[PDB]
Amino acid sequence: VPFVEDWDLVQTLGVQLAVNRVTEEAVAVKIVDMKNIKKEICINKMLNHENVVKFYGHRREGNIQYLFLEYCSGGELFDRIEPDIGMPEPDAQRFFHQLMAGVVYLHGIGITHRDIKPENLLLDERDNLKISDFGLATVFRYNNRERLLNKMCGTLPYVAPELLKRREFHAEPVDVWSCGIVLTAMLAGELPWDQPSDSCQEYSDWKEKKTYLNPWKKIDSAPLALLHKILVENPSARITIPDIKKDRWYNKPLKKGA
């Protein structure tokens, strides 16, 4: 079939929406003028999960790299979060379930995302959540051997406190922490602090258990109890994903089917 390899770029997504000339299939094409991306492509080639943005392949033409990726027509989770309100608890729990599934998957293959936030969590036409953008992602386990991380990266309001305090740290608790900040945002429509430092008053308040303040006062006791287990300063004491899956709120029936 002639023309089947031709794509019309029709709209900027943040990354272009590309539509196939013949089939009308929509994909996202990430255009990166190399005048970093080799690692992103390498990691993307490893990924196959329903809650991770699918990678279809790539083509380079001179200096511009083109990554062909899963198109998520529901846009960013960020835009489902109403400022100062958040979203309905059942929607937040469903999104949180899907986020955990994606992160369990990545961690199982030894990959850490390192920049989980609502801007990077995309939604398909059925509002299924997809983890996107592996530009900051890295290998933390290879040949069944863990490598400790030392590079400071991510996004300050979402970063775990150990990344600011310690020279080296385990990868998995950092992604757990960012998922907790995402959950807070979904349930309160606000981020709890600028960054998790002892200099940050809102972070000190949390450590002193002042949950009569915002954002915490807006969050029901059940999800709040989970957040108390996730947003724990010591990453060794922090809840792991297998234990998140046993959490009372995590397992609370809330949401009807589509």
Ligand SMILES: N#Cc1cc2c(cn1)[nH]c1ncc(-c3ccccc3O)cc12
């Ligand atoms: N990096 C990155 C990246 C980014 C995307 C993607 C794959 N990778 N698929 C998408 N589908 C929709 C969107 C999108 C559409 C509308 C509004 C905001 C968006 O981020 C972004 C991506």
